[PDB]
Amino acid sequence: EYLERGVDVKFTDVAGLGKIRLELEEIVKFFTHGEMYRRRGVKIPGGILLCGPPGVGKTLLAKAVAGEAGVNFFSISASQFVEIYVGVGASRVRALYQEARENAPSVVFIDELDAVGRERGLIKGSGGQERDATLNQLLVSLDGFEGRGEVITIASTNRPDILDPALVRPGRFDRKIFIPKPGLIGRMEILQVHARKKPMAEDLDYMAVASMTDGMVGAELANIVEIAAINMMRDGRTELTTDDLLQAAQIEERGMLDRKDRSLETWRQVAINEAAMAVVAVNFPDMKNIEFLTINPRAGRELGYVRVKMDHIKFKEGMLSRQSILDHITVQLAPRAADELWYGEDQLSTIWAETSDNARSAARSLVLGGLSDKHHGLNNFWVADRINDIDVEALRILNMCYERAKEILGRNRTLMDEVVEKLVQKKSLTKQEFFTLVELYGSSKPMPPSILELRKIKRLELEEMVLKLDMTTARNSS
Template sequence: MTDTSTIKVKLNSNEIYETDNPRSINFKEDLLKKGVKISENSPMTPKEVIPLSFLVLSVISIAFIGLKDSTIFKNKKLSSVDSLDADEVENIKLNFNSVAGNEEAKESVKDIVDFLKNPEKYSSYGARMPKGIILYGDPGTGKTLMAKAVAGEAGVPFYAMSGSDFVQVYVGVGASRIRQLFKKARSKGKAVIFIDEIDAIGKKRSSEKAGGSEERDQTLNALLTEMSGFNEKEGIIIMAATNRLDILDEALLRPGRFDRHIEVNLPDVVAREKILNLHLKNKPIGNINIKDWAKKTAYFSGAKIENLLNEAAILACKENSVKIEDYHVDKAFSVVLAGYEKQNRDYIKNKDKKITAYHEIGHALISSIVLPKEKISKVTIIPSTKGAGGYTLSIPEDSLYQSKEYLRNRIMVLLGGRAAEEIIFGEDHITTGAHNDLQRSTSIAYKMVTEYGMGETLGLLNMGSLKHELSINENDIIKECKSLIDNIYKDVKNTLLKEKDQLDSLSEKLLDKETLYEEDFK
């Protein structure tokens, strides 16, 4: 019998009793002689206990080590995200000569450079330099380049970080990085701190206290505190860039913080010519008409122009050409806007080619009629790697404003492809080729009605400014947009019907040549 203090007895009636274990030597033998069935749970022997104990201790030890390593890992991770990783450049080689165009923006920061060089001069006049400068404008216009040029002209260290570098999972890390950044800049005496995409931490704050919002708020507060805490005479200028000035927190934009706001615009035709010359300076160029390309690249940013010329250089290199010629830039122009031409076109049916030809000539013909000042650069039915079955490239005019008439004509051009399909192939055989055209025309019509004060439903009211103060019937706005599009579409069809002979002849010509140019439309 087991060496336990009690034993359990089960009778034939299934009743169970528990009693003391007599632990006598012959107790088990006597029970067996009486026909009693015995079942016993033997305790573990020392030989069995030792390995099991070792196993349990091993599991506990492994768990402890794992927990310890996890803590170390977590601490290392926290240390990593807390550490500053600012791009520091001691000697910026760029200056204002490296920035083509944007003369107004350059003029607005020249006094900052002078201040960094001679802070005592401004102090003698009792003048205070702006603590912070916001550069705002479309992507690729040269905001980062402008900030680097300021540091280069002044001959001071340049510290650059992105706003997203400050936003982390762990609350407080962003604020710590802000403090480290300013401490590092102060150690140099004079410096330019540049925060790109500052809207990542500087958006208007809300009352909601989500985890990400709390971290962003703490980071923004740390930035505001640091900006309030240093003296203008220290020679540290904070510059930041954003595409959306309107979404930044008011506390960030008030005097004493980022109190100078400089718009960095898309380059005009004169600036584009300067940018072209700047980026072609160190390239082997042949007969390239720079003035002509300055006109063709309307609404191109500086970065987009640089990319255009880089693509042209790559194409010239592929051909082992001695120099970059005008036709290389022309090919690159199509690549940048529409992608590379698809080489394998055997799968395209003749019927689909015909649909594409009429669709593209519909765009081009309407454009030549309602927007005669916009030159048609290229019309092709060769599909591109960006998904277009064909495309029409026209060169828009540089313009400060867009009139109601212009926007209406722009919608006409966008609807020209669909209208041509319907006229030639019938209403039941229109295709999905106008998908992007319809998106863009709808967007223009909606903005005309809701933003530009060119509709009847809202009149001169701007829908964005109303916010939630008034209950607006969206259906009325949609009805007006639809009515506007429908009326324009009727005008487009009537125009193409009057020019049906030209629509047919140009489409046949496009089918034959696959690509038409400006001279084909004269």
């Protein structure tokens, strides 16, 4: 009933494994070299749990490790265990573990334990009672009494925090393996292994494609492959090339490109907004690298957009400076000030009503996030005066950033005009031409010194003053 036929997935059919594959072949060793494991006085760990984002191929990983193990494979949905009546689920898991026991050697797979692995006492109902009964039955089948060494369970959950502490107790679910989002090389391998089944060209550098689809799951890479199969009848070309995959990545990243009737002043307004955004984005190190700048309307966003990719390591670790945030608010204050510099204060539009709210939210978050230097951070107080004064600093930072944005914008009026003319004329601008116009019409942008230069100057100053103390002690003593 719960048995499958025709399992042939191996480690070659799955891509982007890394050192996890090593752990995977450990399971193969657990299924092959087990006599040496047992002779060294070691109990076989029967519980492995794969945790990660959905779409990483948890079922594919289970199929691959089952095929490489060379044993019978069981894959069962956990939603079948939950029933409006109580009792059938415990019998189902008992019969499941029994047929797994008699089919030894074998490996079983149970996906989405979050339906049946919830805490006992979070919902008051008969369904919760059935869930508790099934959880206890699987608890007693896994470790409860002696008599199982050859059946190994495989678990695949997206939220490991809902797991019962009874299950993760040593002896039931001890091995925990995280399968993360693919980085760079995993995306190459997944795209290539999904693209073997389609005729493909030899000039196809997937590096740029994966450099566009940063931080996307393997199922999304399969989708990118899927938007590289049909759509070529409109032009009718010969072979799949780089630009087709680049456009497919652009489509799956933002949406379908649609053209509608429009006036000229609307295009001028949108291009002025995008021009302000890009011009202020140029003058800061936090978002200097600009790739695309367009004003074409898309699905869900009539307004234009800009693309920037600074290294994604500081955001994950949280090492962003205060100057990194105070600039960004200025960037989010780029559109409205441009309106004040182009149409007057009496004719402010309502297109920047979203970025201006982002600027004020970022200012409030920076104020109450400990980055403020009013007393020393201290985003919490007791008396009413200091709590009232907390919000005033957000307004002061907002006004300072708005004035800085206004000054920066007034510094670059010629670059403003040239890039806005190019935006209304071409509707899309790449990195090369935009940076060429920035070089032709830009002003001075003195970059503030980084951490290394400040460290070096402070180190030489410290050494010189400590050696000054050295002579002022020595020649005074000698």
